[PDB]
Amino acid sequence: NKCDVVVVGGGISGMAAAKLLHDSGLNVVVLEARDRVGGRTYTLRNQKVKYVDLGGSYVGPTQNRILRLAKELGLETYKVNEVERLIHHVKGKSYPFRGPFPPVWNPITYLDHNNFWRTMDDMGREIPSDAPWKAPLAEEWDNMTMKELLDKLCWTESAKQLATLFVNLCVTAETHEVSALWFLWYVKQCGGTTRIISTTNGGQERKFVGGSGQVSERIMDLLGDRVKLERPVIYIDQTRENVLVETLNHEMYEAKYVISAIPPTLGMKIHFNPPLPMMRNQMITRVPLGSVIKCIVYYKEPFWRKKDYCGTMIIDGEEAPVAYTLDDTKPEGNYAAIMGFILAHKARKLARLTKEERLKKLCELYAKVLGSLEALEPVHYEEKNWCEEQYSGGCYTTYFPPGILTQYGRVLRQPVDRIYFAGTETATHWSGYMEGAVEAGERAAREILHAMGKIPEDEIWQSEPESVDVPAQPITTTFLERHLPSVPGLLRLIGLTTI
Amino acid sequence: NKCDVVVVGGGISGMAAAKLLHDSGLNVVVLEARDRVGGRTYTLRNQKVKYVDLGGSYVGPTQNRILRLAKELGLETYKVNEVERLIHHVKGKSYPFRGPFPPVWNPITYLDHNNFWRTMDDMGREIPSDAPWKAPLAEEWDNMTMKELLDKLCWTESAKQLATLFVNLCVTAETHEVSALWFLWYVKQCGGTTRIISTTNGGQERKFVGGSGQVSERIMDLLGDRVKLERPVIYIDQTRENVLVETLNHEMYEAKYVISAIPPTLGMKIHFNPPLPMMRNQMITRVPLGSVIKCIVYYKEPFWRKKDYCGTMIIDGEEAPVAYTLDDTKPEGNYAAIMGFILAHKARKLARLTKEERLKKLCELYAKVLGSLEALEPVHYEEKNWCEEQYSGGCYTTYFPPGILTQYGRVLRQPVDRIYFAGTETATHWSGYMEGAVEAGERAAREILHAMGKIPEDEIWQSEPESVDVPAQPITTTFLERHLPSVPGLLRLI
Numbered sequence: 001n002k003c004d005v006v007v008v009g010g011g012i013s014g015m016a017a018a019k020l021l022h023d024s025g026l027n028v029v030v031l032e033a034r035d036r037v038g039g040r041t042y043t044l045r046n047q048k049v050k051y052v053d054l055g056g057s058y059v060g061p062t063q064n065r066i067l068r069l070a071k072e073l074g075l076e077t078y079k080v081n082e083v084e085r086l087i088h089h090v091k092g093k094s095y096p097f098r099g100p101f102p103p104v105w106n107p108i109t110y111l112d113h114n115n116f117w118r119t120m121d122d123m124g125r126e127i128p129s130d131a132p133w134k135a136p137l138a139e140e141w142d143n144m145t146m147k148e149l150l151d152k153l154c155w156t157e158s159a160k161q162l163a164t165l166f167v168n169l170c171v172t173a174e175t176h177e178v179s180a181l182w183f184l185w186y187v188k189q190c191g192g193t194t195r196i197i198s199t200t201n202g203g204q205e206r207k208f209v210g211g212s213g214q215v216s217e218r219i220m221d222l223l224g225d226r227v228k229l230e231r232p233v234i235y236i237d238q239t240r241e242n243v244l245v246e247t248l249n250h251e252m253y254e255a256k257y258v259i260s261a262i263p264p265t266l267g268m269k270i271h272f273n274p275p276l277p278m279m280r281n282q283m284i285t286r287v288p289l290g291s292v293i294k295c296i297v298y299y300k301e302p303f304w305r306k307k308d309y310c311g312t313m314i315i316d317g318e319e320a321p322v323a324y325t326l327d328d329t330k331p332e333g334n335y336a337a338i339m340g341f342i343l344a345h346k347a348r349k350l351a352r353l354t355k356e357e358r359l360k361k362l363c364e365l366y367a368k369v370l371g372s373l374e375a376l377e378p379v380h381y382e383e384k385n386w387c388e389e390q391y392s393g394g395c396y397t398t399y400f401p402p403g404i405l406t407q408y409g410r411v412l413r414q415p416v417d418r419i420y421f422a423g424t425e426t427a428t429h430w431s432g433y434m435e436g437a438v439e440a441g442e443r444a445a446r447e448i449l450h451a452m453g454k455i456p457e458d459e460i461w462q463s464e465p466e467s468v469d470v471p472a473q474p475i476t477t478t479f480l481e482r483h484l485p486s487v488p489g490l491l492r493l494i495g496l497t498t499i
Numbered sequence: 500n501k502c503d504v505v506v507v508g509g510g511i512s513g514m515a516a517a518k519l520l521h522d523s524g525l526n527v528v529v530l531e532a533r534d535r536v537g538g539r540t541y542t543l544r545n546q547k548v549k550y551v552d553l554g555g556s557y558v559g560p561t562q563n564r565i566l567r568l569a570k571e572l573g574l575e576t577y578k579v580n581e582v583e584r585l586i587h588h589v590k591g592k593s594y595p596f597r598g599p600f601p602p603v604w605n606p607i608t609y610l611d612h613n614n615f616w617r618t619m620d621d622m623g624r625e626i627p628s629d630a631p632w633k634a635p636l637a638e639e640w641d642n643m644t645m646k647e648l649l650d651k652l653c654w655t656e657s658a659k660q661l662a663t664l665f666v667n668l669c670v671t672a673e674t675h676e677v678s679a680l681w682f683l684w685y686v687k688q689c690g691g692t693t694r695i696i697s698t699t700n701g702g703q704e705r706k707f708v709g710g711s712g713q714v715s716e717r718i719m720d721l722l723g724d725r726v727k728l729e730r731p732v733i734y735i736d737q738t739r740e741n742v743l744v745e746t747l748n749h750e751m752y753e754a755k756y757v758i759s760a761i762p763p764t765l766g767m768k769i770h771f772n773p774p775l776p777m778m779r780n781q782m783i784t785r786v787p788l789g790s791v792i793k794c795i796v797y798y799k800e801p802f803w804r805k806k807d808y809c810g811t812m813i814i815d816g817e818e819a820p821v822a823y824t825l826d827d828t829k830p831e832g833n834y835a836a837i838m839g840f841i842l843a844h845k846a847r848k849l850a851r852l853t854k855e856e857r858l859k860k861l862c863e864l865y866a867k868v869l870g871s872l873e874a875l876e877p878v879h880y881e882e883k884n885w886c887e888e889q890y891s892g893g894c895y896t897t898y899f900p901p902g903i904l905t906q907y908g909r910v911l912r913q914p915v916d917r918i919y920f921a922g923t924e925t926a927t928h929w930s931g932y933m934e935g936a937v938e939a940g941e942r943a944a945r946e947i948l949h950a951m952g953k954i955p956e957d958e959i960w961q962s963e964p965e966s967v968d969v970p971a972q973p974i975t976t977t978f979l980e981r982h983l984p985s986v987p988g989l990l991r992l993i
C-alpha cells in the first residue's frame with residue numbers, strides 16, 4: 001500500500017531511480033511486470049554457457065554513470081576481443097582490416113565515405129543533446145527519413161550500402177523507417193560516429209564479468225522486499241491527494257509521486273485518470289521500438305583467432321541473416337562464441353524459422369565470411385528475439401519516424417502532475433543504452449527530491465566524474481579528413497578549373 | 500460473467516458486429532470503456548445547435564453498408580449544401596468555382612495538376628484493396644513518404660500545395676508522416692480521387708438527420724443491458740477452455756470468442772495472456788491515428804448563400820487555421836453553421852489556445868474567405884479536439900508511417916486464437932469511415948459464425964446491394980484529362 005514513491009519498471013533505469021531515492025531516506029516500491037528485474041538486460045545462466053547476455057551487454061569509455069553504478073555494486077568489466085583483424089564482407093568477399101572504419105581504396109569512393117561520416121557529425125553539432133527540436137533546420141531534417149538523407153549525401157553505392165548497415169545496426173530499424181533528425185541526434189548524443197561504432201575506445205569496448213543483469217539483480221538485493229515482481233501496472237489515478245497505482249494482480253499502491261521507468265510506448269498499457277494531456281496521449285502511439293534477434297553460436301575453440309581474425313564481422317548483403325558480429329568468448333578464453341545481430345526487416349523475416357534453422361543459416365554465413373569449415377561445427381546456441389516481448393516492445397530502443405520528434409519530442413520527459421519520466425529514452429547522453437537508463441533514473445529521482453524541497457533546482461541534473469578504470473581517448477580527426485572535398489565539392493572544383 | 504461472444508468496443512464497428520451476432524441468436528456482451536457509445540462518432544445535443552456531429556458525420560454513394568444499417572435503425576439522410584459555388588482561397592484571394600476540383604488556368608500548372616490526380620488513380624489500380632502489400636511495387640512505394648512522392652511528381656508549387664492539402668484533409672497527417680503505398684491504398688479503397696473528395700456524388704454527399712451518433716445509440720437500445728458502459732478492457736486470457744476478459748472496474752467476462760473492435764494501437768491498453776505473437780506485438784506500436792479538431796461556428800443565417808457561395812472553402816497556406824470547410828446548416832435552413840477542420844500539425848499548434856481564441860481566428864479567416872463581415876458575428880461555437888481522447892487516440896483513423904504496411908499490414912485482421920479483429924482499420928472498402936466500421940464488424944462477426952460451423956467460408960465476406968436512396972453515379976473523365984501530357988512529358992516533346 002503506502003510509500004513515498006512508486007517506481008514503475010525494474011529495469012536499470014527504475015532500479016537506479018529506486019536506489020537513489022532509497023539512499024536518500026525515502027520509502028520506495030518498484031512494481032515490475034515480469035518475474036525478474038533487468039528489463040532489456042537479461043543474463044541467461046546454464047552449464048553450457050556459464051552466463052550470457054541476451055539483451056544489453058556492452059559498455060565503454062564516456063559511459064561513466066553505468067560504470068560507477070556497476071563498480072559500487074561490486075561488478076568488474078573486461079575488454080571485448082579486438083586483438084586480431086576485423087572483417088568487412090561485401091559482395092560475397094571478405095576484406096580484413098584494422099581500426100574502427102573499413103578501409104576504402106578507390107579515391108572517389110574514399111572521398112564519399114570520408115564526407116559521409118564527417119557530414120553525420122557536422123549535422124550532429126547543430127543538434128542540442130537536450131533539445132533536438134531546437135536545431136536550426138530541425139523541421140527540414142525531421143521531415144525526411146534517413147533513406148532520403150543517404151540518397152542525397154552518398155554519391156557512391158559503396159558509401160550508401162555501408163551507411164545503411166550503420167543505421168540498421170545502431171537503431172535496429174530500416175533507413176526509410178526513421179527520422180533523419182532523430183538519427184542524427186541519436187548518434188551525436190552518443191559522442192558521434194567514431195564513438196558509437198568503435199569497439200576499442202567506443203561503445204562496444206567492454207562487458208561485465210558475470211553479465212549485465214547483475215546490475216538490476218544487485219539493486220534488488222539491496223532493496224529487499226521493496227521490489228514487487230509480477231506486478232504489471234494497469235492504472236494510475238492522480239485525482240486525489242495521494243497517487244493511486246493499481247496492478248494487474250489486484251494490488252493497490254499509494255504514493256506521493258510516481259516514476260514511469262518503462263519504454264514510452266508501453267505507457268499505453270496503463271489507463272490514466274485523469275486522461276493524459278493531448279500531446280503525451282498521442283506521443284505514446286508514435287514511438288515504436290526497433291527489431292532484433294541476438295544470437296550466440298558456441299564453439300569448441302575461438303578458431304577465428306588462429307586465422308588472425310578477432311571475430312568482428314561487418315557483413316553487407318540481403319542474403320546474410322546477420323550484419324554484425326563480435327567475439328563473445330569469456331575473458332578466460334573458454335566458452336568460445338560469436339555474437340551476432342539479426343536486424344530490422346530480417347528479424348521479422350527470419351523469426352518464421354526454427355531455432356535450429358537459424359543456427360544453420362548463421363553457421364553457413366560465418367563459415368563463408370571466415371573462410372572456415374570449423375564454423376559449421378557449433379557446440380551450442382542461444383538466442384533471444386526481443387520483438388516478442390510484451391513488456392519491452394522491441395530492442396534496443398525507441399526510434400522516431402519522420403515528423404514525430406519535432407512535434408512531440410518536448411513532452412518525452414515532461415512531468416504529468418506527480419508522474420516523472422525515466423527510462424533510457426529520456427536520457428541526453430547515451431539514450432538507448434544502459435548508461436542512458438542510469439542518467440534518466442537518477443535525474444527523475446532528483447526531480448522528485450526537488451519537488452519535495454530536499455535539493456535545490458541546480459542539483460536535478462548532475463555531472464559524472466570520468467571513470468578511472470575506463471579512460472576515454474578523445475575523438476580526433478586528421479587534416480585530410482577535415483578538408484578533403486566531398487564528391488560534389490570535387491566536381492565543383494573541376495567545373496571551376498574548366499572555366 | 501458468461502456469454503458466447505465478448506465485443507470489445509461500442510463504436511459503430513463493435514455495435515454492428517454485436518447486432519449481427521445477436522440477430523443470429525448468440526448471447527453477446529459489448530464492453531465499452533467510455534460512459535457513452537459511438538466512439539469516433541459523437542452527436543452533441545443542446546438548444547443552441549439542436550444536434551451536431553463532433554465526430555464522424557458524412558456518408559455518400561457507394562457506402563451501402565452504413566446506409567443500410569442506418570435505414571434499418573430508422574435513420575434518414577439529407578444532402579450537404581452544394582447548390583452554390585465552392586471557394587478556393589489562394590495567395591489571399593477567393594476564387595469561386597463549380598465541380599469537385601478547383602480549376603487552374605496557367606497551362607503548365609494545368610498539366611501538372613491534371614497529372615497529379617491522374618497518377619494517384621493510376622498507381623491505385625495496381626494496389627489490391629484487400630492486400631495492398633501485394634502491389635507490384637509495394638516495397639518501393641511503402642519505403643517512400645507522400646512528401647517524397649509529391650516532390651517527385653509535382654513540377655509546380657501550386658500542384659504541390661494542393662496535393663499537400665489533399666493529404667492533410669484525407670488522413671489528418673502530414674505528407675512526410677505517411678507511407679506513399681498506404682496513402683495510395685487509402686484513396687483507392689474509397690473509390691479513387693473523385694469519389695473521396697466530392698460532396699455531390701462522393702463521400703461528403705450526406706449527413707444523418709439527428710446525427711450519426713444515433714447509429715451506435717439505437718443499436719445499444721436494441722441490445723439493452725448487453726452493453727456495459729465504463730468497462731475498459733484491461734486483460735484477455737486465452738490459456739483456458741473459455742476466453743476470459745477482465746475490465747478496469749474488476750468485472751470478469753467469459754466467452755467462446757472475442758471481437759476486438761478498437762483502433763489497432765489501443766490494443767496496447769490490454770495485457771495479453773499468452774502474450775501476442777511477435778508481429779502483432781510490434782504492429783500495435785507502429786500505427787498512430789491522425790490529429791484533428793472539428794470546429795462548428797454558428798450564425799443567425801446561412802449568409803454565404805446570398806453571395807452564391809455554398810459554404811465550401813478550400814483554403815491553402817500555413818497561416819490559415821482551417822484548410823477546409825463545409826456548410827453545416829440543417830436541412831430546414833436553420834441552425835446556420837460552417838464546419839471546419841484544424842488539421843495535423845495545426846491541431847497540435849492551436850490546441851494551446853482557448854476555445855474563445857480559436858473561435859476568433861476562425862471567424863476572422865471565414866470573414867476574409869467569404870468576403871463578409873457577417874462571419875465576425877457568431878451566435879454559438881462547438882468544437883472537439885480528438886487528440887485528447889484516451890480511448891480513440893485521434894481521428895479520423897489510423898495512418899501507416901513509411902515501411903509499416905508491407906512489414907505488418909497482413910496481421911491487421913489475422914485472428915489471434917479466439918480473438919477476431921473488427922474496427923474500420925480492418926475494412927477493405929472505405930476503411931477509415933463509418934462504412935468501413937460496418938464492413939469490418941459484420942465480417943468479424945461472420946468469421947466467428949464460421950468458426951462455430953454456423954455458416955460456410957464463402958459467406959464470411961458478403962456483398963451489399965446499392966442503396967435506393969443514395970445511388971452512385973459513375974465517375975467519369977474527359978479525353979483530354981486522360982491523354983494530356985505531364986510537365987516532364989511536355990518537356991520530352993521539346
Ligand SMILES: *Cc1cc2c(cc1C)nc1c(=O)[nH]c(=O)nc-1n2C[C@H](O)[C@H](O)[C@H](O)COP(=O)(O)OP(=O)(O)OC[C@H]1O[C@@H](n2cnc3c(N)ncnc32)[C@H](O)[C@@H]1O
Nearest residue numbers: 009011013033039040056057058233395423424432433434
Ligand atoms: C535488447 C537489447 C538491448 C540492448 C542491446 C541489445 C539488445 C538485444 N545492446 C546494448 C548494449 O550492448 N549496451 C547497452 O548499454 N545497451 C544495449 N541495449 C539497450 C539496453 O538494454 C537498454 O537501453 C536498457 O536496458 C534500458 O533500461 P530501461 O530501464 O530504460 O528500460 P527497460 O530495461 O526496458 O526496463 C523497463 C522495465 O519495466 C517493466 N515494465 C514494462 N511495462 C510495465 C508495466 N506496465 N508495469 C510494471 N512494469 C512494466 C519491464 O518488464 C522492464 O523490466
Ligand SMILES: *Cc1cc2c(cc1C)nc1c(=O)[nH]c(=O)nc-1n2C[C@H](O)[C@H](O)[C@H](O)COP(=O)(O)OP(=O)(O)OC[C@H]1O[C@@H](n2cnc3c(N)ncnc32)[C@H](O)[C@@H]1O
Nearest residue numbers: 508510512532538539555556557732894922923931932933
Ligand atoms: C473523429 C472524426 C472521425 C471521422 C470524421 C471526423 C472526425 C473529427 N469524419 C468522418 C466522416 O465524415 N464520415 C465517416 O464515415 N467517418 C468519419 N470519421 C471516422 C469515423 O468516425 C470512424 O471511421 C468510425 O467511427 C470508427 O468506428 P470504429 O467502431 O471502427 O471505431 P471507434 O469509433 O473508435 O470505436 C471503438 C470503441 O472502443 C472503445 N474502446 C477503446 N479501448 C477500449 C478498451 N480498452 N475497452 C473497451 N472499450 C474500448 C472506444 O471508447 C470506442 O467507443
Ligand SMILES: NS(=O)(=O)Cc1noc2ccccc12
Nearest residue numbers: 058169170196197198203204
Ligand atoms: N552496443 S551493441 O553492439 O549491442 C549495438 C550497437 N549500437 O550501435 C552500434 C554501432 C556499432 C556496432 C554495434 C552497435
Ligand SMILES: NS(=O)(=O)Cc1noc2ccccc12
Nearest residue numbers: 557668669695696697702703
Ligand atoms: N469525410 S470528411 O469531410 O469528414 C474528411 C475527408 N476525408 O477525405 C476528404 C476529401 C475531401 C473533403 C473532406 C474529406
